[PDB]
Paper text:
Connexins (Cx) are a 21-member family of integral membrane proteins with four transmembrane (TM) domains (M1–M4), two extracellular loops (E1 and E2), a cytoplasmic (CL) M2–M3 loop and cytoplasmic N- and C-terminal domains (NT and CT). Cx monomers assemble as hexameric hemichannels (or connexons) with a central axial pore. Hemichannels from adjacent cells dock to form intercellular, dodecameric gap junction channels (GJCs), which can cluster to form gap junction plaques in the plasma membrane.
The final model consists of residues 19–95 and 134–216 for protomer A and residues 21–95 and 134–213 for protomer B. The Ca2+-bound Cx26 structure was used as a search model for MR to solve the structure of Ca2+-free Cx26 at 3.8 Å resolution (R/Rfree=0.301/0.333). Comparison of the Ca2+-bound and Ca2+-free electron density maps corroborates the identity of the Ca2+ ions: the peaks ascribed to Ca2+ in the Ca2+-bound Cx26 structure were absent in the Ca2+-free Fo–Fc maps. In addition, the Ca2+-bound and Ca2+-free structures are nearly identical (average Cα RMSD=0.4 Å). The most significant structural differences between the Ca2+-bound and Ca2+-free channels occur at the Ca2+-binding sites. In the absence of Ca2+, the E47 side chain swings by >90o and 7 Å away from the Ca2+ coordinating conformation (measured at the Cδ atom) to form an intrasubunit salt bridge with K188, the position of which is essentially invariant between the two structures (compare Fig. 5a,c with b,d). E42 also adopts an alternate conformation in the Ca2+-free structure. The coordinating carboxylate of E42 in the Ca2+-bound structure rotates ∼90° and forms an intrasubunit hydrogen bond with the Nɛ of R75. The carbonyl of G45 moves ∼1 Å closer to E42, resulting in an additional intersubunit van der Waals contact in the absence of Ca2+. Specifically, the Ca2+-free backbone between residues W44 and Q48 shifts an average of 0.8 Å away from the pore centre and slightly towards M1 of the adjacent subunit. The Ca2+-free pore had a distinctly different electrostatic landscape, characterized by a variegated electrostatic surface with a strongly negative potential in the region of the acidic Ca2+-binding residues. In the Ca2+-free simulation, K+ ions rapidly entered the channel and clustered around the Ca2+-binding sites.
Residue numbers in the entry:
A (entry chain A), D (entry chain A), E (entry chain A), G (entry chain A), J (entry chain A), K (entry chain A): 18 to 96, 135 to 215
B (entry chain B), C (entry chain B), F (entry chain B), H (entry chain B), I (entry chain B), L (entry chain B): 21 to 96, 135 to 213
Write the structure that this text describes.
């Protein structure tokens, strides 16, 4: 109802700044910060790929990428608007579906045990600092849920 | 009033920058756990430093720069935006004092986390600075509260 | 038509940035050769990763942003600039598929290079992502081809 | 006498650029460049905190921060001027007092011997490259002394 | 013939972007990525200085530096033009002469054997990733050859 | 005259940038002292490299870009600003030649500092480049002197 | 039948010399020669104690000790003879019972996987050279079986 | 009686030899203290293993083979030599049980000695054997006591 | 005949002693497997050196000094003791040649055992000697066979 | 009084066996078992030479050597007897004097702090297992004191 | 001339004791004491086998072995004498021939440079303490030369 | 006279045994060269310790127990055997003093051998003892000379 387009940009910018702080001074290169109790070359890297196929940061990076493309299409069409919202919804929903099916959040595995091939046996791989992630997520998740609801609202109003 | 808020805002930003980049840095790497047991250190971190000071304060400025944007958007709630700007800035203090029990920085913590074979001496690096920079980043918050309380109450 | 080209162009740029900076990174350092023989790893790199994906795609965008500049210069050849913009973007795909035999990222390669005393297990790091980001950076190319084929043929 | 406000900005910018070169390609992360002849976890970090409580760079960072706040207050008052100078003096004096009482400059301890608790005994901790600091300081000190005198001058003239 | 001044700037920008990607995500700090089969302090550094006196990146950096100075002189003379080209040619030719006499390209030694003084004997020093250099070069060379020919062309036309 | 000064000024800036960032770098870390005695290397640095070339030249450009700012300030002394601009640029040469005894870069120095148990071989890294870049950064200074001498004398 | 007392001493001496070669130039300090794929202090020692409570060598040492005591008692009684045999049998039988119930021979675990407390997880501990043990055993076992049968024979004859 | 004493004497000697040479060995080296603090291990030894079992038993056989030599010397006190031979052999048991609190061998001890930064896990090696060999070397002592008590009392 | 048997017997003993103590030694420790994978080396031992030469020959002299003791016992079968003394000494040769495929000592073996990540170069130490000492310890056996064949056949 | 010559040989043999067990399975190569909290080549060796100039074992070795020479002289004179005792006393007294002035026993420094030249500073050197030495000593000392008194007794009786 | 059989046994025993001291407290396990400036598994072992095929100690061990067999044969023949000398000569001559052709003595390579296959290149392998070998040899050589001459003398006298 | 020779002979033997086995030991391993250059230490040994004291004295007793055997052989030259027994025992002193410049043991030597990059501090271990044991093993020699001089001269 016209207020929506405000809170969308507010939460958009907010989620962006959070995504920056996350990627920069938290996640970080996590891996390196991924301590595998072992001595078997590739055990750590493979356990990481196994339990962190697509890191949270780059999922969210892609989330904002794809879910800022239709809103850019409209800007070109001017100088389909409802369609760009529909997209802006299902994408932001998709990146959430893949998230929950992958990491089974919102928690953040404190400790993982990997039995990958290089690894001689089941070894204790430690995640690094994961309260300060389980969280950021939360925010990056909640913000997405709201950003859904507002877009669904506008979409529904425009079908009236 | 409105002047000193923006002054201390920019001031706290600059302080926060210097803190994050030079003082704190990647505190972890700069964290020395007397042991040899993979993950004792990292866990003893997430225990004694769940959310680092820098990433609390980043969030502080974020959430406490959000209401001030809503007013600039309505101009195609001000008093409400202040109310928010207060309770957030208060909350980010509450979580701070309940968590770290400041304003002092623990020079040394002893961790008996599960990975750790036993109680081990984990050293923090450069706690004196870190304290100073909290002291500033806290005092500034207290003041920013007060000025918003007088502005809000006056109106 | 012209719109979706620029959209997917900027899109592929952003994808390429995230890839180069966060995903790939300095892949090498993040490359773990089960051995202890100086240069076994590096050689086994230049064998199985002659030109990294990032520095192919950097060149892709370069060469496939060159014809589009000639037209802006003539304005003190357009159809020819498209023709180029196609065959380059096709070439950078040909070299890709002939080289790495994608679209999948080899999880593990076994190198018997000269420095290596024998066949040794060299592990690649994080191939799943890397695959995903290729899949996007390839699909985008296929589309960018098609749209230029319809635009070129139409004219 | 109107020439003062020029040389203030000149020396201000000069000290800034010097502060950059200092922090970036000299001091650096000093610590790391702080070689403690030992093998006792935390001996180096504690000796460092003991003998470098607030590093020179961040003292000076704070110096320019606080001593560019009143000069910003006036810019807001326009769109008290003498008061902003008084502040601009006593602060720049304060950051000098704390400096001399802390590091007893202008020299720069080439070598320090630390008997902190973690350290088993008195150990030789080495500072890293300290001619190329003892100096920069000098400059960052002298510039401050001048920047005092010019502000005291203006302040005194304005009391006439 | 007026088209020249276009393709010069095109190839100039192109070579620049290539020089960036080269220096940043390829060459890199090569050295570090220079594996000397040894254990003798300074053997690697000296073999490097011996076989890579002036790295390719900084040769090319200097190439663009010197070969963008006359074209800047003219911009000052306006607010000698043929002379600035003559320079722009012989310099770009010089940086090629030094290149071929130094590295005997366009190839890129995959492996070098160094018998420098620190080194106890002839040791196998490995260059790091050199298909992905032998190349970039190629480009940075070919572009230079073309950028010569176009400038020689303009120069010759202006002598008519 | 005034033209070639600014040309060579910007030129020397670019040279200085490349030197500081790529050639010199953190020279220290790139400094290999044949020993095992904590602080032998660092001291042998501050002995044979008191003020690195990069941080002399940074200061050179600073002090020799200061007088040229005073004139832009007076415009709400020019000849005096030149005189300064000469004697500084001369001084930064004097300290250079008296200190390092250039223009050559010492390939290898032998340090018998106190931490060092004895005379030890400390290797410098990549002295040939470093020499070249001094040669340019020195020649440029000599020229910048001459042009200011002719401009100053002419007036 | 009088020939027995010969072959007893023959096989006794034979088993002794074999026990020497075993303990000296085979078993050895086995442990040290017990490679636990790990890095967790005490994992190897505990896995060893778990899977080699009483090493083979010292079982056999004790075997010959106890099973040369009655045959010494008789030598004192002279300067009960059947009783000393009965003992000499049941002991040599006992040291075999404990052997088979402990190591489930005659094989010799080439590789053992230990999940002891110090060990972070199930880790691959390697036994060292175990064809050249599985064997010696065999001999030290077979010899015992024969040394039983001969003593049982004499014992039975003397009950007639 | 006199027979079984010499039998069990020679027996306990052989047992003691095997213990000292193969089982115990240089126990220390075979002692694994979860730490990295020079002397934590050694001190935690002298605390939990003041006098090793082998060097108690060596002394046991020494002192309990001394009276039996005096009688062979008088023959150029026998009952007195037995009395001694009893009280010594009893004493070497008393010190054993009061010290180690056997007959079991402590599989694992946790030491908080001064050198140690904290309580650390020190592992003993091969305690099961060591127990067995004590069990024999103790039982033998108990018997050697009894037989001397019956011989002494009988007389 | 009987003389030269005892001569060559004592001779082969001395040779065997020097071999076991100085030449072979603890061959293992003196065994250098180009790898870093716990147990690759040990397994590659038990594969390529199931029963070391020293502990075959120890057994050779044992079993081939057993029949010669039975005759000294019967004297409170001689021809039978020779027959045994032959077939044993023949057997210990058969197992040798079928196992190691001598008389040469493999300078270098390449092991792809399970622990090993791949085929790795395991070096043997000092194979030339070891060969020589086999050559003697084998030739001696061949002769000791022949003399017993002539003595046995003659009778 | 004739009983003396018995208890001398008894205590002589006793002290010998104790000296064996000491040197073999206790002292050992002590050094190696001498843990100097440092990383400075020669600090440990020099601190050892400083605080253990002549190890206890070799003092006692020499003690028995010299104090079994006169008792051997008499055996040659037969195939001066009082003189050989006088020697046998003053020597055994000498080796005790040097002992007490050197190690200030009977205790055994658990921990020593060495500031020798190689050592950068006062460092904590740890002695290895010293209850099980402080002791043996005791015995090797007491036995000497008795062996004195018995020889002094005989000597005095023979002066009557 | 009857004096020969004395000096033979004298020099025999002398050479034996020298051979003991050599093998025990000099040569030693030399290898270990064989420092190859490298880091390439097997380079040291192969260079050793290359330049020390049969170590000096075991050549000499074999020398005394073979050259004490005929002198034992005669002892059996009694309870051919000239033949046993002839052997005793040619053998002791043989072990000298193999020695000089192998090690080209009497010197003792202080330093050897090995280019074996495992070794990446020509590497500096250091022999350990070789004055104190070049020597012992000398003695073990000279003694052999004399022990030849005396046996040749006796042999010649017995051919008269 | 003849008595005290054999006394001091056996005495010097026992001293030599204790020296070789416990004091000196494998001196090398117990030799600490402040460096990291393969073979600097070993060479600096053979320079400052060509023939170790133990292996000089072993030879001393050998050569100075050889003449005393010739006399026992002639008994199926005595004065000549003494003369030899003197000049040898004198020679083994001459080589000692000319070589090591005793009687003191060099606590510390500084080696600039070829392998060594420079002059490096090589520490000797336990020189005080070693001195003492030389002092005895030398004094004994001086006496053994004197007694043979009086015996030889008297005759």
């Amino acid at each position: 109802t016209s207020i929506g387009k405000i809170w969308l940009t507010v939460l958009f910018i907010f989620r962006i700044m959070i995504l920056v702080v996350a990627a920069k001074e938290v996640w970080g290169d996590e891996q390196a910060d991924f301590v595998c109790n072992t001595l078997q070359p590739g055990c750590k890297n493979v356990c990481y790929d196994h339990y962190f196929p697509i890191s949270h940061i780059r999922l969210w990076a892609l989330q904002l990428i794809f879910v800022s493309t239709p809103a850019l299409l409209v800007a070109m069409h001017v100088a389909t608007y409802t369609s760009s919202i529909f997209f802006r919804v299902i994408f932001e929903a998709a990146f959430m579906y893949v998230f929950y099916v992958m990491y089974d959040g919102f928690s953040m595995q404190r400790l993982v045990k990997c039995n990958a091939w290089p690894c001689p046996n089941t070894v204790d791989c430690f995640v690094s600092r994961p309260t300060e992630k389980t969280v950021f997520t939360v925010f990056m998740i909640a913000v997405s849920g709201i950003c859904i609801l507002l877009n669904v609202t506008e979409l529904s109003y425009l079908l009236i």
